[PDB]
Symmetry: C3
């Protein structure tokens, strides 16, 4: 099966979405779903000694301007394993470009973790913890000669707007 | 595929059973299987700083009184990855109720680790180990307001009977 | 089943798929349950050794010892089981296991610039080739088995056996 194709975007879109984690926090290896089989594939080894500061994944049955599934970042105190589904609550969206491609990424918190019960919008996140995620994606492909532009952070109301548009975009392409 | 439905209960029931692990030892994220897809899911982060004292999973093609597959606990020296199949030897069963539901759990050891070759019945497990587990499940939902009762441990003869009953509960429901 | 349906590689024999079954640093020995494709615990290595490499199989291959072709990938950070790697062969290990031709490819990840200049067996520090062979020489000693390390062949010979392993499979199943 291809969990990107088979799974639904979420049980209560857009307040709660399904996050399919490809990369646990602390990983220097970059993974992604093999578009053919849906198995975990090593994309590359980060050219620098950086690690994903967040549990990285995608929202199933979503498509975005950058020709990929919609990227999502989930804050987990304990990193999960690849190909795990999390019920998460979007709280914001990171606005960045990559080689002219709009590579925006939803930021989200888990619903079933009471530690984040009061995290509902971007302002609830420590400012330092936003700067760190921005600096990761600003620099994690420098030694690959790639230039990245961090444009800003949107609030929870915009993050949900983009998912509804990524959900449609998928229906348009594969529907 | 949903592994819970496609795998036989074991190669030699009830002496040896398959343990499909969902939660490695040392984990605090509580995982389960998605009935629709068979993928690993995040059930909940344990509200307390406790970690599963054992490799925790289910026995495929089983059904129990509490409306769920039969839980099995396997004592691994090194944790396995989720969704890994273990050929284990049952040695006992923990009799606990959870919110009024009969939620007994088989305790087992791996066949393929000679460390546990001499482990065969519940008496063979250090008392201090049987206490830590019973305390884990007694309390790992306390902050959630849920009440769990630890009745005690049954021996290997008992745990093996329950397996056969849980098997007969699966063929009956599906 | 990933072994049966994945291709052998995006550019064989120069770039092959490595389907990892055992991440580096693991004392457990995991193999693919060939009937479902799920990970399965073969056996806990009787001795305190850990796999020195990311160990797996090449899909749609079949070798003289009656199993998918073994391949070893030198990863700095070990991956998770069932992870695909596009690797480059730089050598091969020649060893007899119980009288069966049990050769294993040695390769590096294509997308790790650290190993950019690793193109043949000779670019590997000798002491590393000495640690792998010793692992396999003794990792089944307490089990009563006998493994015989013959030597190391170069890349030209590993790519051949890869092609000769892609055919046997077509002959065995195609």
């Amino acid at each position: 099966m291809n969990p990107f194709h088979e799974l639904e975007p979420g049980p209560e879109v857009p307040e709660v979405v399904y996050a399919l984690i490809e990369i646990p926090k602390g990983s220097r290896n970059k993974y992604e779903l093999d578009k053919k089989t849906g198995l975990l594939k090593l994309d590359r080894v980060l050219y620098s000694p950086f690690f994903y500061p967040v549990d990285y994944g995608i929202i199933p049955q979503t498509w975005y301007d950058d020709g990929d599934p919609f990227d999502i970042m989930v804050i987990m105190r304990e990193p999960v394993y690849p190909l795990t589904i999390i019920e998460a609550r979007p709280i914001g969206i990171m606005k960045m470009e990559d080689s002219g491609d709009k590579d925006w990424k939803v930021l989200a918190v888990p619903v079933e973790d009471p530690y984040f019960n009061d995290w509902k919008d971007i302002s609830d996140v420590p400012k330092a913890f936003l700067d760190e995620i921005a600096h990761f994606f600003q620099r994690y492909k420098e030694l690959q000669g790639k230039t990245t532009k961090i444009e800003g952070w949107g609030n929870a109301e915009e993050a949900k707007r983009e998912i509804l548009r990524a959900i449609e975009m998928y229906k348009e392409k594969f529907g």
